[PDB]
């Protein structure tokens, strides 16, 4: 049983340029729990992130919430990057 991570990226608040916000990345439905989740700013990893403790659903697949406080600007692209043993390549989901 090896299930691949679903990645959902969303902000806590509407994207206002120059206003503080939270970028969430919810990664769920993966197994085994070994995983590399990073929030990216301009393709570079964000160190100042938080994440929930590993948890899992009734089907035993795992889920993690990541979030980082950020200030979106026009030039800055943010993303959530997940590497997993079920992935041939790191999956990168951008934020709108």
């Amino acid at each position: 049983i090896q299930r691949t991570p679903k990645i959902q990226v969303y902000s806590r608040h509407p994207a206002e340029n120059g206003k503080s916000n939270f970028l969430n990345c919810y990664v769920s439905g993966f197994h085994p729990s070994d995983i590399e989740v990073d929030l990216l700013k301009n393709g570079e990893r964000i160190e100042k992130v938080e994440h929930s403790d590993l948890s899992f659903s009734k089907d035993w697949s795992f889920y993690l919430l990541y979030y980082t406080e950020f200030t979106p600007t026009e030039k800055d692209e943010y993303a959530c990057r997940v590497n997993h043993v079920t992935l041939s390549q790191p999956k990168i989901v951008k934020w709108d």
Binding site: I1, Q2, R3, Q8, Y10, S11, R12, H13, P14, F22, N24, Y26, H31, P32, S33, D34, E50, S52, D53, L54, S55, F56, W60, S61, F62, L65, Y67, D96
Partner: protein, 277 residues
């Protein structure tokens, strides 16, 4: 209004002599406790995480958990097949209780191995999982036969201690678990459904409790195509929901997102789709 408390454990053996462990306590979907492996102690995540238990009961529980982890590692070594074939592997334990409407407690203690059911604890015996095979039976034989109070301690923990603590938690956390948090909503354009088509997205973020009503509307007519995403967690215990609607270009005008939530007290959030002055 069924409520539940789970202690979960995840541990992965990367090889025969090296394993990672992780543990937490969850009031429904709210994490209330973590575990500090490097002192073997409970992390109380909220002011109220002691949930009406004394420091003595809680430190007894900690001691219990440590004796449990010690026995677990000792036994995993002494009965590991030891061949590199069976590694890496991952065990998940979900133990706890569910309190039903009338007050009837239900205990559970389920284990998975590599994300498949391994065994559970029913009444007073370790039931191996049907779909699984001989590993399940081996572990159940060890737990049913070659142990002492292990099985009875699990019984009391999940049948008596756990509902007691669950209720203490809800009570101590009453101001948190009974709170109301007003969502905010905003509109965006989602991934284009196609040429001449728009994806209207209504984001509702920051509501708690979880029940929420979101619809795209044309006046009072609910748009049938509306899709509700998963209700996603925010940090600090609120929820997020996207309600989306694909519409023809030229049919977007007039559509609005309507949000009802217990915290809004009749005053629904209404946002009209704009996109072009």
């Amino acid at each position: 209004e069924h409520v539940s408390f789970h202690v979960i454990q995840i541990f992965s053996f990367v090889n025969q002599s090296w394993a990672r462990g992780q543990g937490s306590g969850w009031l429904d979907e709210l994490q209330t406790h973590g575990w500090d492996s490097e002192s073997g102690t409970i992390i109380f995540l909220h002011q109220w995480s002691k949930g009406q238990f004394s420091n003595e009961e809680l430190s007894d529980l900690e001691l219990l958990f440590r004796f449990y982890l010690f026995g677990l590692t000792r036994e995993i070594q002494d009965h590991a097949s030891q061949d590199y074939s069976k590694y890496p592997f991952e065990v998940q334990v979900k133990a706890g209780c569910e309190l039903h409407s009338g007050g009837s407690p239900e205990g559970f203690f389920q284990v998975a191995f590599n994300g498949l059911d391994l065994l559970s604890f029913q009444q007073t015996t370790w039931v191996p999982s049907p779909g699984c095979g001989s590993l399940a039976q081996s572990v159940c034989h060890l737990l049913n036969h070659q142990y002492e109070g292990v099985t009875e301690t699990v019984y009391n923990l999940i049948r008596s201690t756990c509902p007691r603590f669950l209720l203490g938690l809800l009570d101590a956390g009453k101001m948190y678990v009974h709170r109301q948090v007003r969502p905010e909503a905003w509109l965006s354009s989602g991934p284009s459904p196609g040429p001449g088509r728009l994806q209207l997205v209504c984001h509702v973020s920051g509501f708690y409790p979880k029940p929420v009503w979101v619809m795209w509307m044309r006046g009072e007519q609910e748009q049938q195509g509306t899709q509700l995403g998963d209700i996603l967690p925010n940090a600090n215990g609120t929820w997020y929901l996207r309600a989306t609607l694909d519409v023809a270009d030229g049919e977007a005008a007039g559509l609005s997102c309507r949000v009802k939530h217990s915290s809004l007290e009749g005053q629904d959030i209404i946002l009209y789709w704009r996109g072009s002055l």
